[PDB]
Amino acid sequence: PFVSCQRGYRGVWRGDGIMHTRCHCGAEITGHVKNGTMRIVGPRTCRNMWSGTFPINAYTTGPCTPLPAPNYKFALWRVSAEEYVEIRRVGDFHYVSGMTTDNLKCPCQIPSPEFFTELDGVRLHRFAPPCKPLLREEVSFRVGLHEYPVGSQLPCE
Amino acid sequence: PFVSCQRGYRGVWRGDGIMHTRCHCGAEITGHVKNGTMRIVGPRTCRNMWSGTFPINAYTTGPCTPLPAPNYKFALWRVSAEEYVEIRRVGDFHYVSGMTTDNLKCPCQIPSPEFFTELDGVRLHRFAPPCKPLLREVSFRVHEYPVGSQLPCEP
Amino acid sequence: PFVSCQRGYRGVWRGDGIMHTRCHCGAEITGHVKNGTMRIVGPRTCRNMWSGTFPINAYTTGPCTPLPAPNYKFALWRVSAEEYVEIRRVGDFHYVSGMTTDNLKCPCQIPSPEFFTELDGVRLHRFAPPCKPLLREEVSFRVGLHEYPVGSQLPCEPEP
Amino acid sequence: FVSCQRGYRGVWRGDGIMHTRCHCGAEITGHVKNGTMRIVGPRTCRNMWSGTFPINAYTTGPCTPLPAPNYKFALWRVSAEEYVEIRRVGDFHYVSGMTTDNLKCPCQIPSPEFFTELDGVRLHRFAPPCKPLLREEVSFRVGLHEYPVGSQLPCEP
Ligand SMILES: [Zn+2]
Ligand SMILES: [Zn+2]
Ligand SMILES: [Zn+2]
Ligand SMILES: [Zn+2]
C-alpha cells in the first residue's frame, strides 16, 4: 500500500545532525536528528510526509545512520558484490528464505540490523545493486564448506 | 612478500565483537574489538598481521564499523553510483583535488570521515565500485567550480 | 623464511633527526624523524621492515628518543646495576608482577612511559643488561623499609 | 606502490654502494659485494620488495649491470635518437622493429649491457624518449645492403 514515492525508514538514528534526501516523486525531504529522533520537513504531496518516513537513496546526505529494531519480518542481505539473500525472522531465529543465485556462499552469524540492505521493503543504505529474482525453492547455500537447502536456519544460533 | 597485501586500517572501531576478513594475498585476518580497539590476528605471511592492520573487503564479515581520525591528507568520496572525488585536507579546510568525471554534481559539505570510501589509501567500506582515472587538470557543480576550489559551504 | 627479529618501536619520537641502527638479523635499518614521525628505510629481509619499526639495540645512533603511549600491559623497569622488575598495569593501577631476584629494592612511584627499558616487548633504551628469568611466584620486593608480596600494587599508588 | 619504475635485479659489474630514486620517489640504495646487489629502500617502493634497482637519470655509484643473455626483446640505440627492438629466438637475433624507416645498423648484436632496455627495464641513464612502435613495411640498412622488418641480424650464421 505504498506508492513510491519510495518507502521511507522511520526509527532511531545514529548521530545527531541534519539529513537530506530526494523521493522518487521529486520531493526533497529534510531530517533533523537530535537525541536520535529525526523530525521530518517535506511537501504535502510526498507520501513520506504523511507517513513520517524518510526514503534512502543515492541522493541521501548527512552525518546520520539508521538504527532499526531487530523485529523485522524479512531482510534482503548483501553477500556478494551483486548477490543478496532473503532472511525471514520467526521468534529469536532467522532462516534463509531465499537467494539471488544458487550455491551462494554466506556468513553464518546474522548481522546487526543496520547492515541489512532492506528491511520489510525499506532501504537502509544509500547505494546498492538492483535485486535479481529471489529463488526460494530447489536451491542450496554454502556456509563456509557444508551446504544447506533453502529454508534452513543460519548455522550459528 | 609485502607487496600484494591490502593496506589495512588501523584505528578506532565502533561497537564491540569479532571481525573477519581476507587479504588479497590470501591470508585470513581476524580482528577482536573491545571498547573501540581492535587486536589483530593473522598468519605471519601477511603484512597486515605485522602492521596491526585490517584489510576491508567484499570478504569482510562482522558487527564493527571503522571510525577514522579527521586528520587525513587525502580522501575518496563516492558521490554517485559510479562517481568519486578526491578531497585534499589542509588544516580546518578541505579542497577538492580530483574527480573521476568532469562537471559531476557535488555536496557542499564534507561528511564524517567514516562515510568516505577510502582514506589515505585505506578502503573503509566493503563494497566500492572501481575508480576511473581521477582528473586534476575541469570543474564540478555544487553553481559551478574549477578543480582545486574549497567546498563552497566551507567559506 | 622467518627472521629472528627483535621487535622494534613504532610511535612518536623526541627531537627531529636521522637515526641508524642494526637489527637482530643484521639489517642496517635507518629512520628519519620529522615532527615526531620516523620514516623507516632498510632491507626487504627484516621484519621490522614489514611492521615499519625501529629496533633499539646498543647499535642505535642519533638525537631522538621514543615517546610511548601510556596504555601498556607489561613494562620492564631497570632498578639496580643488573636487576629488573616487570610492572603489570591494570587500567589506572600498577602491580609489581615479577622481578629478576627476590627482595629487590624498588621505588614506589611508577615512572613515565619514557623511563621503562622495555614496554610490551619493545626495548626503548640503547643500553641494557640482558634480563634474567622473571620470578613470578613465592617472592617479595622491598619498597624502602617495608617488604611486600609479588602481585602487590605500588605503595605510593592510591589503591582501594 | 603500483606506480614504480621496474628495476633490475641481476648481476653487477664492480663493487660498492649505489644510489638512485624511483618514479614513486622513495630513494633506493644497492650494496654490491661479489657481484650481487642488496636493496635498501622505503617500505613504500615496490622496487625494494622486489629486490630490483630502478635505473634513472638519478642513479649514481661505481657499478655496471650485466644481464644474462636469455632475454626476449631488447632496445638498441643505434643513433642519437633512434632505437631498434631486437627479438631473441633462442638462436640468433632478429630485428623486430625500428623507430624510423631505412635505419642504419651494425650487424653484430652486442653484449647484453649495451642495450638501453631489456624487457621494459632500463639499464642506462639519459637515453632519449622512444617514439611509436612501428611493426611493418619498413627496411633497415646493414652495411650497404638493405633488409626487411623481420630478418636475422646479418652477421649471425
Ligand atoms: Zn515522494
Ligand atoms: Zn596479506
Ligand atoms: Zn631483522
Ligand atoms: Zn618505487
Numbering used by the authors:
A (entry chain B): 6 to 162
B (entry chain A): 6 to 142, 144 to 148, 151 to 163
C (entry chain D): 6 to 165
D (entry chain C): 7 to 163
Please share text taken word for word from the publication where this structure appeared.
NS5A is a 447 amino acid phosphoprotein of 56/58 kDa implicated in a variety of roles from the replication of HCV RNA, the modulation of the host cell responses and the assembly of viral particles. The pivotal role of NS5A in virus replication makes it an ideal target for inhibition. Crystal structures of genotype 1b NS5A domain 1 (NS5A-D1) have revealed the formation of dimers during crystallization.
Our crystals of domain 1 from genotype 1a NS5A show a new crystal form, and allowed structural determination via X-ray crystallography to a resolution of 3.5 Å. The crystal structure consists of four monomers of the genotype 1a NS5A-D1 arranged into T-shaped asymmetric units, which are juxtaposed to form large solvent channels; the crystals have a Matthews coefficient of 4.73 Å3/Dalton and a solvent content of 73.97%.34 Similar surfaces of the molecule are exposed to the solvent as in the most recent 1b NS5A Domain 1 dimer crystal structure. The zinc-binding motif has the same coordination as the genotype 1b NS5A Domain 1 with an average distance of 2.24 Å between coordinating sulphurs and the zinc atom. The arrangement and proximity of residues Cys 142 and Cys 190 in our model and the presence of electron density in between the residues suggests the formation of a disulphide bridge, despite the presence of DTT in the crystallization buffer, with a distance between the sulfur atoms of 2.0 Å, 2.0 Å, 2.0 Å, and 2.5 Å in monomers A, B, C, and D, respectively. Dimer AB displays a similar interface to that previously reported, but one of the monomer's orientation is reversed creating a head-to-tail conformation [Fig. 3(A)], rather than head-to-head. The contact surfaces are formed by residues 74 to 78 and 83 to 84. Residues 74 to 78 from each molecule appear to form an intermolecular anti-parallel β-sheet through an extension of β-strand B3 from Val 75 to Arg 78 [Fig. 4(B)]. By combining the different conformations of the new NS5A-D1 dimers present in our crystal structure, one can envisage an array of NS5A molecules that forms a more expansive network that could interact with the membranous web.
